Amino acid sequence: TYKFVNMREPSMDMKSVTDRAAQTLLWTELVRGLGMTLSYLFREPATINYPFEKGPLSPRFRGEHALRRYPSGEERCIACKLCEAVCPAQAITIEAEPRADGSRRTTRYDIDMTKCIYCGFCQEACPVDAIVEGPNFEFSTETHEELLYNKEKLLNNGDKWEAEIAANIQADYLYR
Amino acid sequence: MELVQVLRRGLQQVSGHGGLRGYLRVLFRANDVRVGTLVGEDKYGNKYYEDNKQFFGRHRWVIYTTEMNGRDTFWDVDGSMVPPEWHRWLHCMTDDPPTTKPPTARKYIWTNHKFNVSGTPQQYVPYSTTRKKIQEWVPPSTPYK
Amino acid sequence: RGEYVVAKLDDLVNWARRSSLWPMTFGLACCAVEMMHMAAPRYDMDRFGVVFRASPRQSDVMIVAGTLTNKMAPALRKVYDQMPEPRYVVSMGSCANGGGYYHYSYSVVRGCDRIVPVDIYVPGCPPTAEALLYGILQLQRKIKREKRLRIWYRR
Amino acid sequence: RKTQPYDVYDQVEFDVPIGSRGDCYDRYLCRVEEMRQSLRIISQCLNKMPPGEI
Amino acid sequence: SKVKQDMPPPGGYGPIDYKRNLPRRGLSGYSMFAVGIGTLLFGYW
Amino acid sequence: MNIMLTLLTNVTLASLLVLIAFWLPQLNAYSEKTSPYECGFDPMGSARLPFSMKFFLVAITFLLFDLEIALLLPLPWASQTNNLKTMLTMALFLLILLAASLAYEWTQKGLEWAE
Amino acid sequence: DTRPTIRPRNDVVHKQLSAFGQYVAEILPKYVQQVQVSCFNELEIFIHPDGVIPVLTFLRDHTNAQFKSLADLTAVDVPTRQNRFEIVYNLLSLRFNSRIRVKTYTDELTPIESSVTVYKAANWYEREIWDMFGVFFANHPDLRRILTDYGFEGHPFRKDFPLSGYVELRYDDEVKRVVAEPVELAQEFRKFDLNSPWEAFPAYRQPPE
Amino acid sequence: AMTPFFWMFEEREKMFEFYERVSGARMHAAYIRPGGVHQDLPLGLLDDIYEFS
Amino acid sequence: FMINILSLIIPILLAVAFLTLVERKVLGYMQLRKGPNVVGPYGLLQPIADALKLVTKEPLRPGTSSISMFIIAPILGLSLALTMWVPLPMPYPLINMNLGVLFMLAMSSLAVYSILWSGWASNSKYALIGALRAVAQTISYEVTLAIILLSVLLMNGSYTLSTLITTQEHIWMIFTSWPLAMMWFISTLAETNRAPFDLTEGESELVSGFNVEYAAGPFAMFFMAEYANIIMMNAFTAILFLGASHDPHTPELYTINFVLKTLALTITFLWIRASYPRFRYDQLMHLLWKSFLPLTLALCMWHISLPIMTASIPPQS
Ligand code: SF4
Ligand code: SF4
Ligand code: SF4
């Protein structure tokens, strides 16, 4: 089923024709847009006060990567390399080494944001929820070398950003 | 009657914002004169407000502190002084302040939340996190045999 | 004191510079449409004191938003060089920051910095309208932190 | 959507605006009407969400 | 516990309007014109 | 000479604005900045080739009409004469003559863009 | 299907398309080689290269086919064949709401008569294909690069063409305009030979050889 | 005229708001995948859809 | 005497500067935005911020440009707009002028010449085309503007701007020539190069029209010139139709009334800027020569015989 959109032949009645003539001579439909625009002017603007005020978000938001750690303190990553194998832009580079004890995690864990896509695929690919997409959209910088993190800062990012994601995965662990 | 009602709302606005000095402070720095309930106050001096009566996205807002880690910010500000516990509340990822239920405190979390250190000497630098892979054969210390 | 006077004129110059800088109406890919997302009344580009002008002889800060390609490269450098000084460049998104999702592509230059100097690298793919609106703020702070006529006085 | 339905689009009911001149005014008018017909699809989709997995 | 997801209300959501609701405002063309000369003729007097 | 004084002041005040906007705000030109603008690319090379009008017909009629209005500018003083009878006919006659010329051009195409 | 996992079938359509598959075969026995309808109701006509313009004309013209819409132009490249590039058309019949696929084969050197006359939509699809794959077609109006960089040598979509390309460019201040150089990646494409060493589908397995 | 652009980009942003609510990001969801959507909608999302529609 | 000149010139520049703020702010409020409010209280410091930054921006001199031609036009544009503010009948005009409107009309035509010359002086397509669209724009409005101007003041008595206050007196002039004010208002819209008739600028169509090679200070004089032009000609339409009462003992009573009349009318100029799409300069000369010209003759014939109709010939003095 379809609905015809544009054909309505105007009536040639004296009342109807003087309507179009009045509309033409006296700008009436033209002032209709002018007039409503006045009504919309008096509406209070829907502008937030950045950075004093920030827009709504959701627990399942993708931001900067942050390598988390267990409540004891041991970092969750166990070098399964699934995040590297899934990363659609190969932003992850992984090297591993059994060091001394129950802490062989990474020789190298470099996430390349200017290469990364922020798809979040690494987050649900991780079997231990080690690498996560943090809730911080605010990690801009001035140098290109800044926009890549080493393994250490991922740990520092997970250390610095810890309360937010711990509660975020707390609320979202059943959805995914 | 409603006209003078909004006039006294402005008269309430100047009075409630710490008199004239506070109102001129927020007008020239906070860029807004709205008054909200004191929802919380973190350890960094950042003053937070909540006004559920306002339309969505303008219910919860933040007045930033004048000092953070020796980075005087009375005039200039940015969206990164917010500590991790409150950063989810500001972005309304949740309808609970950290004061009502604090996050699970553990040993390794930072005690002083930091901001973008870009430009400052505290900025990050990329570096190799791996050891040397091909170490060279050290020349013998002894002279000609 | 001469340094006091130069500092006062310095404060006058950057305040006008960071308050009245004019981003270029330049857009390439996914980042461009989110760039105009924040220009929408939700985030209000203009309330921070900036307005969109088109030609290079018109604007202050180049806002590179989208994938940079080999064919796009000659015009971008031409249009950037065509902007009178002072001029700044911010790099929207992972793609323009460097390489991006198509870093390994044959028809993508790995980095807008490989072609034009860059002040700030705003990340995200696409960067949320909040994140880059801070990127403008960081440039306002960066414009604040200069000593152009001050370094000249001690030069 | 109507000639070769896909997914669950067969059960939904809506109209497709059809122009009469093939000019810019018709296309803009069909685009506007498609938005209204899109809203009707949202109403049917909202009230017909079935239980089960994802 | 029973399965719970995001579901429509038991009665269902309200009726979603989609048609045009353009107002019919203004006055008749004769009245608009007759006003035009009416104030106009006042002018020359 | 009062009009001269404000005219001299006006063109003077304009000249200071261009004067300190050309020397004070730095100077750095390196050719491609100095080059013409072609929406990012290099022009075909011209800006001097004949940019032929497509409305040349109406341009000359403007000269005839802008000329003839100068014939009816004296109207406010022409009303206050002892002979408004022939004044009414002659002044009317001009307006019909412009009306006829506009009507003549209108009917024989004219105003519509020549293609 | 009582089982809700697998996709259902439309056997009525599958046979119906197969009936039309043999329909075209008798109509043009010179040009078609074999006509196959896949399991998921997609009936493809396989025609000879030199007869490209007539079969497309027949489907656009014939009442029983009436396929007048050039959906897409693709020339999927398979290096193992003598004439690698197999040019695949894509047509939609509005009156019979069905899709047809006609395809040929053509090496790097053999030219094809351009189908712009039979399908004006082929025009820009033609400018793209010669760009990406490098198969020249004959008597095209303005066959010329419309995808790749101005003067970019080599057809990038070819199998022998590396994904990273051969050249990269960078602005140089000593000449004050951008300039190209051989490609030298900061990070190479780490190839991921993830193909499973175990057979995945007994049905599609080739006969022993 | 530029005002229609700013009329509905507000409402366009709301559709971005549910976009980010049910998916990982605002624009590029990577949501619709072969075999079905990535994950279930958050509770209360449909009610917001009802109000916006 | 010169103290009167500076008090006539200097306030206009600040008024022009604060026009940029309201241009960017009432539009935003008329557009669900909040407008510039980050620079000082409510943005009132933004017009200052624009001024210095534009002045301290690098001036640009394109290689293919004619240097003398590139500089004379911006001077002409700003100077005429500023000198356009001397002859208005604002309670005590700076210069009484027998041919008040002719002085108004003559240099208004010379104002477009600065608009005209800058296009080719910049030596490119995007300015040559914008310059030639200025030709067609002033092809249209000029052929008729004198007709409206003659018609409205034919009941005034003479061309002196001062006599407008006496002529209006009891009632608004628009009450007597409302279809003329319909003609006059939007034709001024067509000369100020505002949104519905800004083809000379042409934001979307040709980047910036007659501004593409202009930068820094030359624009600052150009931006002020056209902002001064709209306010002045709006003040012209304020006295032409909405002239208020003037008490000789209290001249300030006229200023407060006149200022709002040209201010609320100005808000309209910002009002149309938001709500209406762009005329194509094809229909611009088409419309003003198809319906506008034949109509404006009819009321011109109406407005000449009608003083003779009712023995209401106005005195020249
Ligand atoms: S979102 Fe995660 S998996 Fe995807 S590219 Fe970025 S880091 Fe890699
Ligand atoms: S972050 Fe997770 S997926 Fe990646 S290597 Fe570590 S444990 Fe494996
Ligand atoms: S960074 Fe992401 S959003 Fe931006 S242009 Fe590249 S792919 Fe599009």
mmCIF file of N, CA, C and O in Angstrom, chain I residues 55-95:
data_model
loop_
_atom_site.group_PDB
_atom_site.id
_atom_site.type_symbol
_atom_site.label_atom_id
_atom_site.label_comp_id
_atom_site.label_asym_id
_atom_site.label_seq_id
_atom_site.Cartn_x
_atom_site.Cartn_y
_atom_site.Cartn_z
ATOM 1 N N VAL I 55 41.731 42.595 14.010
ATOM 2 C CA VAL I 55 42.762 43.587 13.726
ATOM 3 C C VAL I 55 44.151 42.966 13.833
ATOM 4 O O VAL I 55 45.021 43.213 12.990
ATOM 5 N N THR I 56 44.378 42.142 14.855
ATOM 6 C CA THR I 56 45.675 41.501 15.041
ATOM 7 C C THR I 56 45.882 40.293 14.136
ATOM 8 O O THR I 56 46.976 39.721 14.138
ATOM 9 N N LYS I 57 44.870 39.890 13.375
ATOM 10 C CA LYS I 57 45.037 38.827 12.396
ATOM 11 C C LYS I 57 45.884 39.319 11.228
ATOM 12 O O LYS I 57 45.952 40.519 10.948
ATOM 13 N N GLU I 58 46.533 38.384 10.551
ATOM 14 C CA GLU I 58 47.418 38.741 9.444
ATOM 15 C C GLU I 58 46.616 39.261 8.260
ATOM 16 O O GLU I 58 45.743 38.545 7.754
ATOM 17 N N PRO I 59 46.868 40.479 7.788
ATOM 18 C CA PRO I 59 46.261 40.912 6.528
ATOM 19 C C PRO I 59 46.853 40.128 5.370
ATOM 20 O O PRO I 59 48.027 39.750 5.392
ATOM 21 N N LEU I 60 46.036 39.881 4.354
ATOM 22 C CA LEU I 60 46.450 39.056 3.233
ATOM 23 C C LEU I 60 46.284 39.808 1.921
ATOM 24 O O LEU I 60 45.265 40.469 1.693
ATOM 25 N N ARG I 61 47.296 39.692 1.063
ATOM 26 C CA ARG I 61 47.376 40.405 -0.210
ATOM 27 C C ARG I 61 47.627 39.374 -1.302
ATOM 28 O O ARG I 61 48.786 39.049 -1.596
ATOM 29 N N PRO I 62 46.577 38.834 -1.922
ATOM 30 C CA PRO I 62 46.770 37.753 -2.897
ATOM 31 C C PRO I 62 47.665 38.177 -4.054
ATOM 32 O O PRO I 62 47.685 39.341 -4.461
ATOM 33 N N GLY I 63 48.417 37.207 -4.575
ATOM 34 C CA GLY I 63 49.432 37.515 -5.569
ATOM 35 C C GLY I 63 48.860 38.079 -6.854
ATOM 36 O O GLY I 63 49.436 38.990 -7.454
ATOM 37 N N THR I 64 47.724 37.550 -7.294
ATOM 38 C CA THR I 64 47.105 37.979 -8.540
ATOM 39 C C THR I 64 46.223 39.210 -8.370
ATOM 40 O O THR I 64 45.608 39.653 -9.345
ATOM 41 N N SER I 65 46.153 39.771 -7.167
ATOM 42 C CA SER I 65 45.277 40.902 -6.902
ATOM 43 C C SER I 65 45.897 42.208 -7.381
ATOM 44 O O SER I 65 47.117 42.332 -7.513
ATOM 45 N N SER I 66 45.035 43.188 -7.640
ATOM 46 C CA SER I 66 45.461 44.554 -7.925
ATOM 47 C C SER I 66 45.527 45.303 -6.599
ATOM 48 O O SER I 66 44.497 45.520 -5.952
ATOM 49 N N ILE I 67 46.736 45.700 -6.200
ATOM 50 C CA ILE I 67 46.964 46.149 -4.828
ATOM 51 C C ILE I 67 46.162 47.410 -4.530
ATOM 52 O O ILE I 67 45.440 47.484 -3.529
ATOM 53 N N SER I 68 46.269 48.420 -5.397
ATOM 54 C CA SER I 68 45.549 49.667 -5.158
ATOM 55 C C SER I 68 44.043 49.451 -5.207
ATOM 56 O O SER I 68 43.298 50.028 -4.407
ATOM 57 N N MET I 69 43.579 48.623 -6.142
ATOM 58 C CA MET I 69 42.153 48.335 -6.230
ATOM 59 C C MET I 69 41.689 47.529 -5.023
ATOM 60 O O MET I 69 40.538 47.654 -4.587
ATOM 61 N N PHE I 70 42.577 46.698 -4.471
ATOM 62 C CA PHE I 70 42.228 45.862 -3.328
ATOM 63 C C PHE I 70 42.042 46.680 -2.057
ATOM 64 O O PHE I 70 41.394 46.217 -1.114
ATOM 65 N N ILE I 71 42.603 47.887 -2.007
ATOM 66 C CA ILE I 71 42.628 48.669 -0.775
ATOM 67 C C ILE I 71 41.602 49.794 -0.833
ATOM 68 O O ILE I 71 41.022 50.171 0.191
ATOM 69 N N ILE I 72 41.368 50.338 -2.028
ATOM 70 C CA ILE I 72 40.455 51.471 -2.149
ATOM 71 C C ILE I 72 39.019 51.042 -1.864
ATOM 72 O O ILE I 72 38.246 51.787 -1.252
ATOM 73 N N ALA I 73 38.640 49.839 -2.297
ATOM 74 C CA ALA I 73 37.270 49.375 -2.087
ATOM 75 C C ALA I 73 36.903 49.234 -0.614
ATOM 76 O O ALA I 73 35.833 49.731 -0.222
ATOM 77 N N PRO I 74 37.703 48.586 0.245
ATOM 78 C CA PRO I 74 37.324 48.535 1.669
ATOM 79 C C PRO I 74 37.215 49.906 2.307
ATOM 80 O O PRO I 74 36.376 50.110 3.193
ATOM 81 N N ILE I 75 38.050 50.857 1.883
ATOM 82 C CA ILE I 75 37.926 52.227 2.369
ATOM 83 C C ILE I 75 36.585 52.810 1.953
ATOM 84 O O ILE I 75 35.880 53.435 2.753
ATOM 85 N N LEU I 76 36.210 52.603 0.691
ATOM 86 C CA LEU I 76 34.951 53.133 0.184
ATOM 87 C C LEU I 76 33.761 52.506 0.902
ATOM 88 O O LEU I 76 32.776 53.188 1.209
ATOM 89 N N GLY I 77 33.833 51.203 1.175
ATOM 90 C CA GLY I 77 32.718 50.536 1.830
ATOM 91 C C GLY I 77 32.470 51.050 3.235
ATOM 92 O O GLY I 77 31.331 51.335 3.613
ATOM 93 N N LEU I 78 33.534 51.181 4.027
ATOM 94 C CA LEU I 78 33.363 51.612 5.409
ATOM 95 C C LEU I 78 33.072 53.107 5.487
ATOM 96 O O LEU I 78 32.232 53.539 6.285
ATOM 97 N N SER I 79 33.755 53.911 4.668
ATOM 98 C CA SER I 79 33.581 55.357 4.740
ATOM 99 C C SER I 79 32.160 55.768 4.377
ATOM 100 O O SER I 79 31.567 56.625 5.043
ATOM 101 N N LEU I 80 31.596 55.174 3.323
ATOM 102 C CA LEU I 80 30.234 55.527 2.937
ATOM 103 C C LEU I 80 29.232 55.128 4.010
ATOM 104 O O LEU I 80 28.290 55.876 4.293
ATOM 105 N N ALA I 81 29.413 53.952 4.611
ATOM 106 C CA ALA I 81 28.510 53.525 5.673
ATOM 107 C C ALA I 81 28.569 54.478 6.858
ATOM 108 O O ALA I 81 27.536 54.800 7.458
ATOM 109 N N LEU I 82 29.769 54.942 7.209
ATOM 110 C CA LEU I 82 29.900 55.877 8.319
ATOM 111 C C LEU I 82 29.371 57.258 7.950
ATOM 112 O O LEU I 82 28.635 57.873 8.730
ATOM 113 N N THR I 83 29.728 57.764 6.766
ATOM 114 C CA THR I 83 29.210 59.056 6.332
ATOM 115 C C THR I 83 27.730 58.998 5.993
ATOM 116 O O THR I 83 27.111 60.050 5.806
ATOM 117 N N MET I 84 27.157 57.799 5.900
ATOM 118 C CA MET I 84 25.724 57.666 5.690
ATOM 119 C C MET I 84 24.929 58.079 6.918
ATOM 120 O O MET I 84 23.705 58.215 6.835
ATOM 121 N N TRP I 85 25.595 58.266 8.054
ATOM 122 C CA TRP I 85 24.927 58.554 9.314
ATOM 123 C C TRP I 85 24.819 60.042 9.619
ATOM 124 O O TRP I 85 24.264 60.402 10.661
ATOM 125 N N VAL I 86 25.330 60.910 8.753
ATOM 126 C CA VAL I 86 25.258 62.350 8.994
ATOM 127 C C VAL I 86 23.896 62.966 8.658
ATOM 128 O O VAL I 86 23.456 63.855 9.401
ATOM 129 N N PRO I 87 23.184 62.572 7.600
ATOM 130 C CA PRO I 87 22.039 63.385 7.155
ATOM 131 C C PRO I 87 20.672 62.985 7.699
ATOM 132 O O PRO I 87 19.686 63.624 7.317
ATOM 133 N N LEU I 88 20.575 61.971 8.557
ATOM 134 C CA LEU I 88 19.265 61.533 9.017
ATOM 135 C C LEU I 88 18.610 62.604 9.889
ATOM 136 O O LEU I 88 19.295 63.394 10.545
ATOM 137 N N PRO I 89 17.278 62.644 9.915
ATOM 138 C CA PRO I 89 16.576 63.678 10.683
ATOM 139 C C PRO I 89 16.464 63.360 12.163
ATOM 140 O O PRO I 89 15.553 63.868 12.826
ATOM 141 N N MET I 90 17.331 62.471 12.674
ATOM 142 C CA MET I 90 17.505 62.286 14.111
ATOM 143 C C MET I 90 17.450 63.663 14.758
ATOM 144 O O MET I 90 18.092 64.593 14.255
ATOM 145 N N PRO I 91 16.764 63.812 15.908
ATOM 146 C CA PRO I 91 16.037 65.059 16.211
ATOM 147 C C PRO I 91 16.650 66.328 15.643
ATOM 148 O O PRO I 91 15.943 67.150 15.052
ATOM 149 N N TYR I 92 17.957 66.496 15.807
ATOM 150 C CA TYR I 92 18.680 67.624 15.221
ATOM 151 C C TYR I 92 19.697 67.076 14.232
ATOM 152 O O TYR I 92 20.784 66.630 14.640
ATOM 153 N N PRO I 93 19.390 67.069 12.934
ATOM 154 C CA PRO I 93 20.315 66.475 11.963
ATOM 155 C C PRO I 93 21.647 67.207 11.935
ATOM 156 O O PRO I 93 21.715 68.426 12.113
ATOM 157 N N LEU I 94 22.717 66.440 11.712
ATOM 158 C CA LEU I 94 24.048 67.031 11.613
ATOM 159 C C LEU I 94 24.109 68.033 10.471
ATOM 160 O O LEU I 94 24.637 69.141 10.627
ATOM 161 N N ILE I 95 23.581 67.657 9.312
ATOM 162 C CA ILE I 95 23.515 68.526 8.144
ATOM 163 C C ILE I 95 22.081 68.507 7.632
ATOM 164 O O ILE I 95 21.614 67.478 7.129
#
